[PDB]
Amino acid sequence: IVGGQECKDGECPWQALLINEENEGFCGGTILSEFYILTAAHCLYQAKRFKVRVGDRNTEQEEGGEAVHEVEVVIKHNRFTKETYDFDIAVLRLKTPITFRMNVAPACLPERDWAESTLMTQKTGIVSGFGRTHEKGRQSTRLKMLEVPYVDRNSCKLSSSFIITQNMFCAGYDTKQEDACQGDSGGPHVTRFKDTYFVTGIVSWGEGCARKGKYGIYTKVTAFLKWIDRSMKT
Amino acid sequence: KLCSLDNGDCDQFCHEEQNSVVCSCARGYTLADNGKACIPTGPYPCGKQTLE
Numbered sequence: 583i584v585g586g587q588e589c590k591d592g593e594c595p596w597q598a599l600l601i602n603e604e605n606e607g608f609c610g611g612t613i614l615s616e617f618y619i620l621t622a623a624h625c626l627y628q629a630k631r632f633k634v635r636v637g638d639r640n641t642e643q644e645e646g647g648e649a650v651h652e653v654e655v656v657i658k659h660n661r662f663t664k665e666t667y668d669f670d671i672a673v674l675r676l677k678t679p680i681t682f683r684m685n686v687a688p689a690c691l692p693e694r695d696w697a698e699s700t701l702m703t704q705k706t707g708i709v710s711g712f713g714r715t716h717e718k719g720r721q722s723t724r725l726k727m728l729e730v731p732y733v734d735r736n737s738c739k740l741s742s743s744f745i746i747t748q749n750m751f752c753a754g755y756d757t758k759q760e761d762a763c764q765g766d767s768g769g770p771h772v773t774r775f776k777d778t779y780f781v782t783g784i785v786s787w788g789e790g791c792a793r794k795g796k797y798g799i800y801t802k803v804t805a806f807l808k809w810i811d812r813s814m815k816t
Numbered sequence: 817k818l819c820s821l822d823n824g825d826c827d828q829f830c831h832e833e834q835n836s837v838v839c840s841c842a843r844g845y846t847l848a849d850n851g852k853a854c855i856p857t858g859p860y861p862c863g864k865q866t867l868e
């Protein structure tokens with residue numbers, strides 16, 4: 583996350599972090615339930631063996647809420663493609679259930695039509711992660727969050743040197759220096775409605791981080807609600 | 817009109833059925849007696865920042 587702020591105690595409880603063999607985060611995730619994590623398909627090529635950590639805000643100290651979980655099943659979208667990042671979505675079933683507590687709770691899954699007409703037309707969503715703090719800076723040791731405006735679809739298509747498919751949406755700023763960045767991929771994009779937070783996006787890609795005339799691109803969760811439901815029953 | 821007017825007074829999801837607003841809630845909430853508000857069924861309901 584470039585810019586924004588630290589998540590304060592209890593403010594981003596649905597954040598998950600995918601960790602490599604060396605216990606280093608390389609991608610984010612969203613807690614959907616006691617057994618399921620939402621992440622990006624492209625993240626499943628960034629490591630051979632990985633685990634999921636939840637309840638963490640400072641990767642430099644033991645806060646007492648942290649829990650590491652093993653993955654029982656990786657469910658990647660079968661139409662995902664590396665050339666365009668179309669269908670950039672995966673669901674993970676954990677070996678053991680997540681015990682909810684302070685800093686550990688799920689985000690809500692919305693219904694499609696309501697989310698698209700009511701959530702996706704709000705001014706902003708919120709993105710979060712332990713990712714890079716500069717286009718070529720080091721990763722954050724602190725979980726951060728950032729309010730990102732929804733961006734007009736036509737304007738987004740005009741600014742992009744890469745195809746924006748029906749399974750993607752744009753959010754962020756034209757020139758202001760705030761954006762998601764490397765290592766935030768797979769992480770939550772949530773929308774607040776009457777003090778309840780619903781999953782609306784997954785951190786997917788972007789031409790650098792926070793560049794002038796460029797926006798952050800997210801997987802459009804609302805187009806995947808039936809697929810997510812199927813994956814979570816099996 | 818209906819759901820386009822302040823979300824039809826619904827706490828969460830709003831749907832129109834035969835010129836009428838129908839409210840509903842995410843999994844883990846139950847629709848209150850007034851047919852509009854959403855009540856958590858147990859601890860740590862989805863979508864809420866944690867306070868304990």
Ligand SMILES: C[C@@H](C(=O)N1CCOCC1)N1CC[C@H](NS(=O)(=O)c2ccc3cc(Cl)ccc3c2)C1=O
Pocket residue numbers: 664665666667744761762763764765767785786787788789790791792797798799800
């Ligand atoms: C253009 C794109 C890319 O290589 N793609 C391959 C083909 O499909 C489009 C994505 N790039 C180029 C570099 C960039 N990597 S990154 O700086 O680590 C990164 C990753 C995810 C991001 C997500 C957001 Cl929302 C914003 C900035 C990001 C930056 C990235 O995702």
Ligand SMILES: [Ca+2]
Pocket residue numbers: 638639640641642643644645648
């Ligand atoms: Ca910690």
